[PDB]
């Protein structure tokens, strides 16, 4: 019955701006404390900030690494919450959650004695930060020293790239690994085939890299 | 700041405790969260002893000193997820902080040691004024490893970038770690090692120019 939907995710260049919207239903939103939480992909959760309701003076608090750049606001007439992201940096990537926040309150101790907790969460909205818009990859051979050889695919945006060996003829022992986003904002990944040492030269191995967004196809032979 | 062990494994139907440590815990209780990949987090426990409706009774929270612990008695396969602790960062603070999170694996397969392959910078790459060491880790379970790069025996921290492990098709996990060096840095040293620790055992692969 309680539902939170986040929206506004997309790609923004460093220094850019973006507003996330989180629409709520199934509870008295006017009084509820709301918290933004973000998760860098493959990493842990980070508390972004919380905004209170009118009764608490619309008091808002921000995490230290985010203060001065993000603003939290809300429209109680529309049941929406906003995260206004300005001077946006690469570390701000990328998954952002809005949460209905509960709190301990005692008349003598105020809120300082208790803690906050986020009883319901949205599914999340993804914000990618990078100066690149469309960049073909560079492909390098990972030569053999059971032997192992592969290809290194470097500095591309956006995902995905598809790696095939010998135009799809080679599938046994092939293992293309998940890509990784570098601090530059570009992706790099590697695909390696493992073959017995004797066969290393009797057969020639070529990797086929296909980055559709930049419309590139790269073929690279691997030689010992 | 709240500290959690990154990985914990438990056998089916057994009992496991995930612990979170921090200075602020001596003054405040901690809430506990379960997050599964591609899914919203779920609050499991908060305050002294508060369990939301619908949370099975086999989850339970405790606290003593600078420690807050979550306990799962009779673990089920649905309990495999990330677990996070949350609390105030400082006593009486207005802000809140999350812990690093703990990947809980409920054992569904035999433990598998990682296969590691270390690749030196390709000759063509060095001609372009770049150097990238590629260490590839595959065929391990449960999916949690630590990667330490060493130049000779001297630890290296700059230039390292590691992916979060993800399940392969053969039901195990695979990860990769890249060390980026200047071309001069690669030539200078005798060896560059990639050491992968998993379940208390460490595998080392070494390359040299």
CATH number of the domain that A195 lies in?
2.60.40.10
Q: In chain B, which segments carry CATH 2.60.40.10?
A: 2-106, 115-207
Note whether B42 contacts A: Cβ–Cβ < 8 A: yes
Nearest chain B alpha carbon to A113 = B92
CA angle B75, B79, B80 (to 5 degrees): 115
Rounded-to-integer distance, Cα B136 and Cα B120, Å: 12
- Separation of alpha carbons A206 and A191, rounded Å: 11
Residues spanned by the domain of A186: 138-222
User: A137 is written with which tokens?
Assistant: 């990859």
* Cβ within 8 Å, pair B40-A117: no
Q: How many CB atoms sit inside 10 A of residue B15's CB?
A: 12
Cβ A97 vs Cβ A40: under 8 Å:
no
Compute the C-alpha angle A13/A18/A19, nearest 5°. Answer: 165
Tracing tokens 């008295």 back to the chain, one arrives at A28
Per the structure, how many domains does chain A have?
2
Q: How far apart are CA A91 and CA A125, in angstroms?
A: 16
H/E/C letters for each residue in B177-203?
Answer: EEEEECHHHHHHCCCEEEEEEECCEEE
Beta bridge partners of B138: B115, B174
Domain check: are A101 and A20 in the same one?
A: yes
> How far is it, in rounded angstroms, from Cα A192 to Cα A187?
17
The shares of helix, strand and coil residues in chain B, as percent rounded to the nearest 5, are 10, 50, 40
CA angle centred on A180, ends A175 and A186, rounded to 5°:
125
> Within a 10 A sphere around the Cβ of A41, how many other Cβ atoms?
13
Neighbouring C-beta atoms of residue A60, cutoff 10 Å = 16
Pairwise CA distance, residues A58 & A70, whole Å? 16
Task: Give me the residues of B, 166-195, that contact A with CB < 8 A.
Answer: 166, 168, 174-176, 178
Burial class (CB in 10 A: 0-12, 13-18, 19+), B19: middle
**Residue B193 near residue B150, CB atoms below 8 Å:** yes
Q: Which residue has the tokens 């270390």?
A: B118
Contact A207, A220 (CB under 8 A): yes
Collapsing DSSP to helix, strand or coil, B43 comes out as strand
Q: How far is CA A27 from CA A44, A117, A120, A216, B162, in A?
A: 28, 16, 11, 50, 41
Angle at A183 between CA B163 and CA B4, to 5 degrees: 50
3-class state of residue B30 by DSSP: coil
Q: Quick one: CATH architecture of B2-106?
A: Sandwich (2.60)
Q: How far apart are CA B63 and CA B74, in angstroms?
A: 21
Distances (CA, A) of A196 to A145, A200, A203, A223, B168: 12, 7, 11, 15, 22
Q: Of B16, B41, B44, which Cα lies nearest the Cα of B30?
A: B44
> CA A184, A185, A191: angle at the middle one, nearest 5?
100
Residues B102-118 as b or e (16 or more Cβ within 10 Å = b): bbbbbbeeeebebbbbb
Q: Which residues contact B62 (CB under 8 A, 6 or more apart)?
A: B68, B69, B71
Nearest CA among B135, B143, B141 for reference residue B117: B135
Q: Which residues of chain A have a CB within 8 Å of the CB of B82?
A: 44
DSSP string, chain A: --EEEEE--EEE-TT--EEEEEEEESS-TTT-EEEEEEE-TTS--EEEEEE--GGGTT-EEE-TTTTTTEEEEEETTTTEEEEEE-S--GGG-EEEEEEEEEE--BTTTBTTTS-EEEEEE---EEEEE-S-SSB--EEEEE----EEEEEEEEEEBSS--EEEEGGGTB-SSEEEPPPEE-TTS-EEEEEEEEE-SGGGTTS-EEEEEEETTTTEEEEEEE--
Q: Tell me, yes or no, whether A61 and A83 share the same domain.
A: yes
| Co-location of A55 and A114 in the same domain | yes
Tally of helices (H runs) and strands (E runs) in chain B:
2, 19
The one-character DSSP state at B50 is B
Nearest-neighbour CA in chain B from A87: distance (Å)? 22
Distance (Å, whole) CA B193 – CA B184 = 17
A11 φ, ψ to 5°?
Answer: -105, 130
CA dihedral sign of residues B90, B96, B97, B103: positive
Per CATH, the number for B115-207 is: 2.60.40.10
Q: Are A108 and A143 in a shared domain?
A: no
**Which structure tokens are listed for A218?**
């790269």
Question: Which residue among B28, B138, B161 places its CB closest to the CB of A115?
Answer: B28
Rounded Cα distance, A135 and A215, in Å? 9
Which of A129, A160, A188 delimits the end of a domain?
Answer: A129
- Nearest of B141, B78, B105 to residue B16 by alpha carbon: B105
A-B Cβ pairs (cutoff 8 Å, strict) = 122
Contacts of A119 (CB under 8 A, 6+ apart): A99, A100, A101, A102, B43, B52
Cβ-Cβ contacts under 8 Å for A28 (sequence gap 6 or more) = none
Please report residues of A whose CB lies closer than 8 A to that of B178: 180, 188
* Chain-centroid distance, C-alpha B182: 28
Helix segments in B101-200, DSSP class H: 123-127, 183-188
Question: Do both A116 and A182 map to the same domain?
Answer: no
Chain B residues inside the 8 Å CB shell of A182: 161
| DSSP state, residue B12 | T
Whether residue A162 is found in the same domain as residue A63: no
Report CA torsion sign: A164, A152, A155, A217.
negative
Measure A134 CA to nearest chain B CA, in Å: 21
Interface touch B87/A180, C-beta < 8 Å: no
On whether both A164 and A64 belong to a single domain, the answer is no
Domain identity same for A88 and A158: no
How far CA B31 is from CA of A23, B58, B151, B170, B191, in Å, comes to 24, 16, 41, 36, 46
Rg (CA), chain B: 21
What is the dihedral sign for C-alpha A32, A33, A34, A35? negative
Q: Which of B4, B3, B9 is nearest to B144 (CA)?
A: B9
Q: Does A103 touch chain B (CB under 8 A)?
A: no
Q: Are residues A154 and A114 in the same domain?
A: no
Other CB atoms within a 10 A radius of the CB of residue B138 amount to 21
Contact A45 B136 (CB under 8 A): no
CB < 8 Å to B125, chain A: 140, 152
A122 shares contact with chain B (CB less than 8 Å): yes
């Amino acid at each position: 019955e309680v539902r939170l939907v986040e929206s506004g995710g997309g790609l923004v260049k460093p220094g850019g701006s973006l507003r996330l919207s989180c629409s709520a239903s199934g509870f008295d939103f006017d009084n509820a404390w709301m918290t933004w939480v973000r998760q860098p992909p493959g990493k842990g959760l980070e508390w972004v900030g919380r905004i209170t309701g009118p009764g608490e003076g619309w008091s808002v608090d921000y995490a230290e690494s985010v203060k001065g750049r993000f603003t939290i606001s809300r429209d109680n007439t529309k049941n929406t919450l906003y995260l206004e992201m300005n001077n946006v940096r690469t570390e701000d990537t990328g998954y952002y959650f809005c949460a209905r926040t509960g709190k301990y309150y005692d008349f003598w101790s105020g809120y300082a004695a208790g803690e906050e907790y986020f009883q319901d969460w949205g599914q999340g909205t993804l914000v990618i930060v990078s100066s690149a818009s469309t960049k073909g990859p560079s492909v390098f051979p990972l030569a053999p020293s059971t032997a192992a050889l592969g290809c290194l695919v470097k500095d591309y945006f956006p995902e995905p790239v598809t790696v095939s060996w010998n135009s799809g003829a080679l599938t046994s022992g092939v293992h293309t690994f998940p890509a990784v986003l570098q601090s530059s904002g570009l992706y790099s990944l590697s695909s390696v085939v493992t073959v017995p040492s004797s066969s290393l030269g009797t057969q020639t191995y070529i990797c086929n890299v296909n980055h559709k967004p930049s419309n590139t196809k790269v073929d690279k032979k691997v030689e010992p | 700041e709240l500290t959690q062990d990154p990985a914990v494994s438990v056998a089916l139907k057994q009992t496991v405790t995930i612990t979170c440590r921090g200075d602020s815990l001596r003054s405040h209780y901690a809430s506990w969260y379960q997050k599964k990949p591609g899914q919203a987090p779920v609050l499991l426990f908060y305050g002294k002893n508060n369990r939301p409706s619908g949370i099975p009774d086999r989850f339970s929270g405790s606290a003593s000193g600078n420690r807050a612990s979550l306990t799962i008695t009779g673990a089920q396969a649905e309990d495999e997820a990330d677990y996070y602790c949350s609390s105030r960062d400082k006593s009486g603070s207005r802000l809140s902080v999350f812990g690093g999170g703990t990947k809980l694996t409920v054992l569904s397969q035999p433990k598998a040691a990682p296969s590691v392959t270390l690749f030196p910078p390709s000759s063509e790459e060095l001609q372009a004024n770049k150097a990238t060491l590629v260490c590839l880790i595959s065929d391990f379970y449960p999916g949690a490893v630590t990667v330490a790069w060493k130049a000779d025996s001297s630890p290296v921290k700059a230039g390292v970038e590691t992916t979060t492990p993800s399940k392969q098709s053969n039901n195990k996990y695979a990860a990769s770690s890249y060390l980026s060096l200047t071309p001069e840095q690669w030539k200078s040293h005798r060896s560059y090692s990639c050491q992968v620790t998993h379940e208390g055992s460490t595998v080392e692969k070494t390359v040299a120019p």
